Design a protein around this ligand. Structure first.
Ligand code: GDP
Ligand code: GDP
Ligand code: MG
Ligand code: MG
Lengths: 165, 161
């Protein structure tokens, strides 16, 4: 479904970021679009890439030069650990910084509220409020619950992304 | 060349482990042997792999694939005094595994560039390396940022297989 709408001749660049241990690597792997490749453009800055035909997913941790990899980004996936209540405030701050990058002003926002399987995970209502998504203007956004370990939610989120480019 | 020595017909499997943040991914990248590939064979277990001709490095974090292993590289953060005991415990666990009794051991005392780093004698001591019998081992200081020490360590590894 989403694969159909994303594939083509023109490069499709997706940025997936979030705090460490949000589940970003696990998501890449569960997509099955090919090998996860790690590069280190500078020491301490680990970048994971999955490239399949015209589609690129670029992943790194935030909250710990970036502007280079923002070129022609069409979507931001922001992954949050729904169970990490102590760092939701940090996640909000890093998301908002991403969102005032002019280079990516026309990128749509998909939020994965990940680790939905966990007994004290925040609800999608809670995650949406605490990330301040309602405050977003002039950008399409969606927040989608996910479990990156069984893959629940991932295709639903990507389907929305593909439909709204 | 440490590379030319490892090269040949016979498979050469190296296992590189250590605590998270020890410097293992940085070391792999510095080796320039090929793309680093991540797999997740089981939930929560991230494995990084570099394969070049007959040589494969397999990397994962311990703390917090043993068949035909010719060498174990253990990477320790020389500047992390609070966790070297945990590094010792995980190293000793691995060296007790039957499947790998025949593997030689290279220890990289990494992050040697940092001004407060433990000296090699102290790393050696706090890892209990001297207590290891019936295994060839070597401790080498390294800096993964600029490659200091890496070639020296790998050359010892290639020589002593
Ligand atoms: N329970 C649960 N654990 C998850 C989920 N997604 C990731 N994890 C675990 O959280 C840890 C961090 O995952 P990882 O993908 O490496 O996060 P990254 O640092 O953002 O790339 C790993 O142990 C994962 O197995 C999830 O949806 N549910
Ligand atoms: N100062 C210094 N920092 C290092 C060295 N090796 C790695 N690092 C840093 O330590 C952190 C963790 O290294 P990484 O390769 O990701 O460790 P891994 O978790 O064992 O794969 C990164 O911020 C690196 O920049 C080193 O030799 N010296
Ligand atoms: Mg990751
Ligand atoms: Mg690593």
């Amino acid at each position: 479904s989403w694969l159909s709408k994303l594939l083509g001749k023109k490069e499709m660049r997706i940025l997936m970021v979030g705090l460490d241990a949000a589940g970003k690597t696990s998501i890449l792997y569960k997509l099955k679009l090919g090998e996860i490749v790690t590069t280190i453009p500078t020491i301490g800055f680990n970048v994971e890439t999955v490239e399949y035909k015209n589609i690129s997913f670029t992943v790194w941790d935030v909250g710990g030069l970036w502007r280079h990899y923002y070129q022609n980004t069409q979507a931001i996936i922001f992954v949050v650990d729904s169970n990490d209540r102590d760092r939701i405030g940090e996640a909000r701050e890093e998301l908002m910084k991403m969102l005032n990058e002019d280079e990516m002003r026309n990128a749509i926002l998909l939020v994965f509220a990940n680790k939905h399987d966990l007994p004290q995970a925040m609800s999608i209502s809670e995650v949406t409020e605490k990330l301040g998504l309602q405050t977003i203007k002039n950008r399409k956004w969606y927040c989608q619950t996910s479990c990156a370990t069984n893959g629940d939610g991932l295709y639903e989120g990507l389907d929305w992304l593909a439909d709204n480019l």
